[PDB]
Design a protein around this ligand. Structure first.
Ligand SMILES: [Zn+2]
Lengths: 79, 826, 33, 172, 69
RNA sequence: UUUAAAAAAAA
């Protein structure tokens, strides 16, 4: 579970889980995505994405990082 | 099964009826297909349709041992007139002759027995060990068990234990690639079947044409349901599986899905069916291969290994007629499988047919009602006294043979030998008392160090001296681990066996055995030097060498701890036991016969003579016991309970209350009748009454315990009070009943679900209102409907029209589209 | 006490056809259809 | 009784020892050197080892360990050294009784120690006791001879839930 | 008297031991562990030390020394 | 920019 997960940060306001799911479906099978919302009413600037296969987590990092969505790149990290 | 058989017969003769609780088709026919319970009802109420019958064809008569539903068979056989003739189909069983003798003795006519083990197509049994890499042909078509392959498979299992994501996926993929495609996977759990079916959602056994045909058939089958029902997840999400050629069949599913999957499999459109044991009893649904995932099932009591009977019954579903010339059965064995268990399972024969007769208030009440007959008749002839009567000659011969053998032996001077023997036995008993004193955990535990030398001797078998290693408070029993010589037979199948001493001729393995504390015959005092790492099999032999050296140093036995001073036991009881044993020892030594020689053989012969004497005593005791009807006391207690509640008159004539109680047979009678006569139902609206009755007819191990708000709690607690009264009265009549269990039998888990369903909620809503499988909800709903019909009948019997109207409305509300969906086999 | 007798009818190999009948009666062969 | 007292000359501690702080004061091992080559030859090594034991305990306790809370009371088979009354005490009699208690007696041969009095343990648990050291074994059977067989399960301790864990199945 | 017999029980070697070569085959010591922290704590160390003594003597004696009067 | 084991069935 944890190994196949992938943490994300620097997501713009309009970035919804649907956009991330669509983007990462191409990278690999996207199990699901999390955008926890703190005591602010909107999801935090970070998120989590779960891939079916661990092989996606490297390849996705090898493929996507700092992608300019909504005029802001997106950073990708691990646990 | 009745529906399927009716379809077959109708396609054969067309002069066929059907009479089950759910439906009745063409009742005025000549060939009626009806479940046993309907037949029992007709017998008890004496319908004219029964008059014209000439043949009765019981099917799956071996089902008579169903514990709970077994009785409903014997009654039907007993109450049938003697002019009829039976045809008892069954599965292979050893004690068929006993059943035939019972029929002869009961109806006084010849009864034949045609026993045959012949099968059309041979079977090959393979075993797949957990962690292995192949299938080992344990049993060949010829029936000759192959010992070498079985040993190799179990050796692989052991090596894996002491060392395609899932095994089932590998097995099924291999089956597909070896052209064994039509496969039935018997897993003894609904969740296991679900999981294994889901895991295989990456293969495809169906050609495109098969996909089109399956889609069309499924749509045609489901078109009967309403549009909202078609939207249910259960119907929609099975369609992909059937499209790709994978099916699931277990009691949890919806009935209509079960029937559709049965049709598809029978027509060959499904090539891998994950099913529980129920599908085994299906009719005309064979397959080329059968796969057992787990050889463990939970029966009514608790987990257990599947008996050889069940294994034979399920494996019989392997190998079609003619199309395939070989049948394959694959058994997957996990770590907790001993070679002895596997051998018994593969080589054992079918279980014997033993009755399950047990009284029910319905039987007692019905027999009391009718005249010129009483329950004693049923008890006398109910294939349970018959087995004991058949057994009596055996015990008679046994006691006679033991008596003649006992008198055969010759003792020259029995008085002196007997006195000496009794003195010796008293000494042994006093020694046992002393040992029971030593093993108090507050006295011997300080002495069980990891080197201590203790002899452990479970009655009958003695392991010899062994070195203690560890002890612990298991959970207050104390488990002491010693290091004994094991037999290399109980050491290889240790997964289930306990332990066994090394046979005298051979050499053991010197393994660690967890014995109980009170099995230490003697706690010697010579603490060896323990290697401190007893894993390698070389140190555990240096320990044996050390023990032998210590024994060779003490030529006359190793010293033992003195219970009094060495262990510091102070309580006077030990003192008195010591005095008694001292006195008995002196009286023994003084005996004139002690010094004489050759008294050892005389002592042994006297001991065996006493053994034979006690064996005769027990055998004749039980022979005397068995010469009386068994459940007679139970019948008296039941009659006491019935009369004390007003059902049965003091002269044993059914009172109006008992007459009413006769009708209700699908649930408890005393509770329902008492509540009906206490006016409990005369205020509740139809919904609460239906919900409560649902609480009556539900029995499933679920711990959801949903909260009942207002209209479902008060009635539930009133029912609880009435049940408590019944339990107390029954207990007062010397009737074995655990009040807590009786009050806990009525599980109200579905009360709210059934209430909401009666209110008019859609099925999808209620299916999401709880956790039980939808199939269980449907089953309980059907059972509740039939109970409500019986309740309407009882209300009519008492002439209380209000209850009739209330229960009629309850029937109307809960009888609609999906739950009571007519089976497609009709 | 039951009074029955189990006469083992001879048969072609494959099945063990045997008939249990009351002791007071005497076994007789089955007439052909 | 007088003859027994005469024979128990070795097991006779003098009466009058001003024993205070019984936990650390009071005697330590009493060794009865026996008439054989090993003992006669290594008497001095034995005495030096006992002195080293005392020194090691003092060093390791007065500096590192600061609990010394639990106590192993003598087992029921523990004798008390028989004092010879050459003087009268007042209140330390009970303290002397507690301090001069024999807990464990061992007669060492070459290949097996003939033992009696056993060893004390805390609430019947070798793991929590002081002088107990269990060997290492496999325990292959797991089926008692005369009986039926045997909160954050990840940790293995049934005291806390995994939700608040400080030391970190087909429902579908 | 019972108490004194109990106490003297410690000084009682069992009758029956087959002792030949009295110089080596026989007791090495007899340690009476007392009720204080040190003896309770270093029980295993003491036993290991005695075993080491036996081992060292066996080595040195059976290997090198010849007279050892 | 890191929210336990559980089958089967009916008047
Ligand atoms: Zn934890």
């Amino acid at each position: 579970e944890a190994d196949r997960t992938l943490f994300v940060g620097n997501l713009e306001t309009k970035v919804t889980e649907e956009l991330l799911f669509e983007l990462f479906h191409q990278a690999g099978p996207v199990i699901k995505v999390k955008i926890p919302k703190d005591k602010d009413g909107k999801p935090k600037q970070f998120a989590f994405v779960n891939f079916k296969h661990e092989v996606s987590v490297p390849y996705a990092m090898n493929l996507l990082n700092g992608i300019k969505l909504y005029g802001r790149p997106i950073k990708i990290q691990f646990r | 099964l009745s529906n399927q058989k009716y379809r077959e017969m109708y396609e054969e003769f067309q002069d066929v009826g059907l009479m089950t609780g759910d439906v009745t088709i063409n009742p005025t026919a000549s060939c009626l297909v009806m479940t046993t319970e309907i037949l029992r009802s007709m017998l008890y109420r004496g319908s004219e349709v029964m008059r014209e019958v000439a043949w009765v064809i019981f099917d799956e008569i071996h089902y008579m041992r169903d514990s709970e539903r077994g009785v409903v068979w014997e009654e039907t056989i007993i109450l049938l007139p003697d002019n009829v003739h039976y045809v008892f189909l069954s599965a292979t069983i050893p004690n068929a002759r006993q059943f035939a003798e019972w029929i002869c003795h009961l109806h006084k006519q010849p009864c034949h027995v045609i026993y045959t083990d012949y099968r059309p197509t041979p079977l090959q049994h393979y075993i797949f060990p957990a962690g292995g890499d192949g299938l080992h042909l344990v049993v060949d078509e010829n029936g000759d068990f192959r010992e070498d392959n079985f040993n190799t498979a179990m050796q692989v299992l052991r090596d894996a234990g002491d060392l395609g994501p899932s095994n089932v996926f590998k097995i099924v993929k291999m089956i597909m690639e070896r052209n064994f495609q039509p496969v039935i996977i018997f897993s003894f759990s609904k969740k296991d079947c679900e999981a294994y079916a889901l895991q295989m959602t990456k293969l495809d056994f169906n050609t495109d044409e098969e996909k089109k045909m399956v889609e069309e058939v499924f749509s045609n089958a489901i078109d009967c349901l309403s549009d909202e029902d078609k939207k249910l997840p259960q119907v929609e999400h099975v369609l992909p599986l059937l499209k790709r050629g994978i099916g699931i069949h277990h009691g949890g599913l919806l009935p209509i899905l079960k029937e559709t999957i049965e049709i598809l499999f029978s027509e060959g459109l499904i090539k891998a069916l994950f099913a529980t044991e129920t599908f085994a009893m299906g009719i005309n649904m064979p397959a080329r291969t059968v796969l057992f995932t787990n050889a463990r099932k939970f029966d009514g009591k608790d987990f257990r290994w599947i008996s050889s009977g069940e294994y034979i019954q399920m494996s019989g579903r392997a190998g079609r007629r003619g199309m395939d010339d070989r049948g394959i059965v694959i058994l997957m064995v996990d770590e907790k499988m001993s070679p002895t268990i596997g051998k018994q399972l593969l080589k054992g024969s079918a279980d014997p047919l033993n009755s399950a007769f047990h009284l029910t208030y319905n039987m007692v009440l019905n027999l009391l009602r009718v005249e010129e007959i009483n329950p004693e008749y049923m008890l006398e002839k109910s294939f349970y006294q018959f087995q004991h009567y058949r057994a009596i000659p055996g015990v008679v011969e046994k006691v006679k043979n033991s008596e003649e053998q006992y008198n055969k032996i010759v003792i020259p001077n029995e008085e002196s030998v007997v006195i000496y023997y009794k003195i010796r036995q008293q000494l042994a008993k006093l020694g046992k008392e002393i040992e029971e004193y030593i093993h108090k955990p507050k006295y011997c535990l300080p002495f069980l160090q990891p080197g201590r030398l203790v002899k452990v001797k479970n009655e009958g078998d003695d392991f010899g001296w062994g070195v203690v290693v560890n002890f612990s408070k298991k959970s207050p029993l104390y488990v002491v681990e010693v290091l004994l010589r094991c037999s290399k037979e109980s050491l290889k199948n240790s997964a289930t066996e306990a332990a066994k001493p090394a046979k005298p001729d051979e050499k053991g393995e010197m393994q660690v055995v967890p014995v109980l504390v009170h099995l230490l015959s003697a706690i010697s005092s010579v603490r060896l030097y323990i290697p401190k790492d007893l894993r390698p099999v070389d140190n555990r032999q240096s320990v044996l060498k050390s023990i032998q050296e210590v024994q060779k140093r003490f030529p006359d036995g190793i010293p033992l701890l003195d219970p009094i001073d060495d262990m510091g036991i102070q309580d006077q009881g030990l003192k008195k036991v010591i005095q008694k044993v001292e006195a008995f020892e002196h009286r023994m030594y003084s005996h004139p016969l002690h010094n004489d020689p050759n008294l050892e053989t005389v002592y042994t012969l006297c001991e065996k003579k006493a053994q034979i004497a006690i064996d005769i005593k027990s055998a004749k005791r039980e022979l005397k016991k068995a010469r009386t009807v068994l459940q007679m006391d139970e019948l008296k207690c039941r009659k006491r309970v019935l009369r004390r509640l007003g059902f049965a008159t003091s002269s044993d004539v059914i009172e109006m209350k008992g007459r009413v109680a006769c009708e209700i047979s699908s649930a408890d009678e005393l509770l329902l009748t008492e509540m009906m006569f206490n006016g409990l139902f005369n205020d509740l609206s139809a919904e609460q009454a239906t919900a409560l009755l649902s609480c009556f007819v539900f029995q499933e191990n679920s711990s959801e315990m949903p909260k009942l708000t207002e209209q479902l709690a008060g009635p539930l607690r009133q029912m609880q009070e009435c049940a408590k009264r019944i339990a107390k009265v029954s207990a007062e009549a010397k009737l074995e009943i655990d009040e807590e269990t009786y009050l806990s039998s009525f599980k109200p888990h579905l009360m709210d679900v059934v209430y909401t369903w009666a209110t008019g909620a859609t099925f999808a809503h209620i299916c999401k209102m709880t956790d039980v499988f939808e199939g269980s909800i449907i089953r309980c709903m059907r059972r509740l409907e039939e109970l409500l019909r019986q309740m309407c009948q009882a209300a009519k019997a008492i002439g209380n029209t209000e209850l009739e109207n209330k229960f009629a409305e309850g029937i109307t509300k809960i009888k609609r589209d999906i739950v009571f969906a007519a089976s497609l086999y009709l | 006490m039951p009074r029955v007798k189990v006469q083992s009818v001879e048969t072609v190999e494959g099945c063990t056809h045997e008939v249990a009948l009351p002791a007071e009666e005497d076994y007789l062969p089955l007439k052909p259809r | 009784n007088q003859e027994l007292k005469r024979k128990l000359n070795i097991l006779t501690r003098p009466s009058g020892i001003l024993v205070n702080d019984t936990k650390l004061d009071g005697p330590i091992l009493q060794i009865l050197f026996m008439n054989n080559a090993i003992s006669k030859q290594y008497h001095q090594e034995i005495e030096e080892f006992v002195s080293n034991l005392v020194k090691r305990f003092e060093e390791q306790q007065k500096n590192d360990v600061e609990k010394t809370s639990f106590n192993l009371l003598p087992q029921p088979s523990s004798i008390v050294l028989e004092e010879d009354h050459k003087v009268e005490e007042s209140c330390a009699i009970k303290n002397n009784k507690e301090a001069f208690s024999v807990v464990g007696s061992v007669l060492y041969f070459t290949n097996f120690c003939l033992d009696k009095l056993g060893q004390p343990l805390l609430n019947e648990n070798p793991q929590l006791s002081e002088g107990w050291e269990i060997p290492k074994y496999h325990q292959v059977f797991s089926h008692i001879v005369s009986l039926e067989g045997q909160h954050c399960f990840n940790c293995g301790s049934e005291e806390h839930q995994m939700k608040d864990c400080p030391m970190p199945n087909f429902q579908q």
